[PDB]
Design a protein around this nucleic acid. Sequence first.
RNA 1: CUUAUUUG
Length: 227
Amino acid sequence: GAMERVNPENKAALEAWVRETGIRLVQVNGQRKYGGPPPGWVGSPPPAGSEVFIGRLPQDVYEHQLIPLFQRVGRLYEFRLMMTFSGLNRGFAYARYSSRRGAQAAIATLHNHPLRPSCPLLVCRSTEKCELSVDGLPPNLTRSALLLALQPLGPGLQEARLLPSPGPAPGQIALLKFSSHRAAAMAKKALVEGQSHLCGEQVAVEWLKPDLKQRLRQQLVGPFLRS
RNA sequence: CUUAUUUG
């Protein structure tokens, strides 16, 4: 029989695994995330580039493959894996390492890992979610009103600054530091949902980028090199 | 780089 039916043995295999480590994948309306890593180490990820994200993966692979592939390049603190149902499952996931040295090895090891002859497994980092980015903004409105305009929908905001535009054109950029990933996502989501066009102008909501951040920093160091 | 969570 079979060969014309689904294979539940796959999703059953990881169930038999999570039970033997006691991680018990927490569901998110259908998504899944791993946590509560095995003993042999103690601590918590410090402020570091310990963030890593794989992409362009197979739509049929399970975390029972991606997760061990993470625990071998470095200490995993928390992995997460998501898919969609608009017509077909996606294949993308990310993880946070005990330190950036684990995250740096992971990309340099998994990006160069051809899981299949047709799957150039892509990886990335520095998408910490800890910070939010904005573009366009109001015409002349002050930075104080920008925050207030999004403060009731993102009360987790600790600090924000507006200056270092991506260039070459003017228009500044707004860089918000939230209390948590989701805290920035709750605010970020409201802006893409339609809380944008503040002061009747225009806005574009996006996260930090590894190319954006170096350009941000190269001009941010400017006023910071002195008192 | 062939780049993602807010969610399907």
